[PDB]
Amino acid sequence: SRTVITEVIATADSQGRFLNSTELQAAFGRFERAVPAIEAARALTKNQDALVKGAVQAVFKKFPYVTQPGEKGYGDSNQAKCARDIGYYLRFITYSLVASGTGPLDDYVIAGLREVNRAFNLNPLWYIEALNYIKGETGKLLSGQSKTEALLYIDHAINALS
């Protein structure tokens, strides 16, 4: 799980040396940038339900054809799977915010992403549009540096999808 502290430790361990000035300042920057990321985590965890339902509806609007029968969107089971997937994405983005690192996303979504989307035929543009919705929402639910944190992690997830 790659974070600021994890990279700090990995480098100094690979070199076989004690942690020194460089990575101590890196960890300091992480500790200082924790609090806006932490309270952005607060914000996204609080409003999870509305964000998931809105993102699902935005996906079903941008891709109306998925709704009609014979497609992936037909059915309550598929619908619940859509909500579950968007909730997974939101949960792991909050994990990345609290962790001050991309490690949670890399470990839990990005790793194995394309293979299983190809295997289960899950179009990545669906989740890209959902994440763009959540991007629009975090544009208004957050202000200041926390807005920037949420946007960076969300659009990192998007780039991983795109």
């Binding site: 990995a10 004690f18 101590l24 924790a34 949960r91």
Partner: protein
């Protein structure tokens, strides 16, 4: 390898839920105390030769048998390996201190060190004694109020003592 934030995320994911406000405010408090942690880690790093030298001096004061012929620290080679091991354990303890969890210490320094020492004939008791003396010296160097602002960090002192004792307990 693993962190305290990543520990909490692991618990959250095995539970299958978001992060609770209790764990999350705990993590915020850890983030604020991170500066005290940085001072603790720097205190360990800046004094590693001093801690190691003191620990080895008193270790070979207590146990002559290691440095007599037939001892396990006798030739220059085995003495050098000894001091290298002291260096390694202290380094990984500092890593565990900065991270906030003792995951890295076990997962890297201490996977198979006991059976290594058993096969080599190294007395694990004396290794654990050396780690204890290292803890004593490190605690001496952590308490230093000079060159740093005054406050309470007994949480750090307890956590560092636990890391040292966990390493020593894994040794023997």
């Amino acid at each position: 390898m693993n962190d305290v934030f990543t520990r909490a995320i692991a618990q959250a994911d095995l539970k299958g839920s978001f992060l609770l406000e209790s764990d999350l405010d705990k993590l915020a408090s850890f983030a604020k105390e991170g500066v005290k942690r940085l001072d603790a880690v720097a205190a360990l790093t800046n004094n590693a030769p001093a801690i190691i030298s003191d620990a080895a001096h008193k270790l070979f004061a207590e146990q002559q048998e290691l440095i007599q012929p037939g001892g396990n620290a006798y030739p220059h080679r085995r003495m050098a390996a000894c001091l290298r091991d002291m260096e390694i354990i202290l380094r990984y303890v500092s890593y565990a201190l900065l991270a906030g969890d003792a995951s890295v210490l076990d997962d890297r320094c201490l996977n198979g060190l006991r059976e290594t020492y058993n096969a080599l004939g190294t007395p694990t008791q004396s290794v654990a004694r050396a780690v204890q003396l290292m803890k004593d010296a490190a605690m001496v160097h952590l308490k230093s109020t000079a060159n740093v602002t005054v406050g309470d960090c007994s949480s750090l002192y307890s956590e560092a003592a636990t890391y040292f004792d966990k390493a020593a307990a894994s040794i023997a």
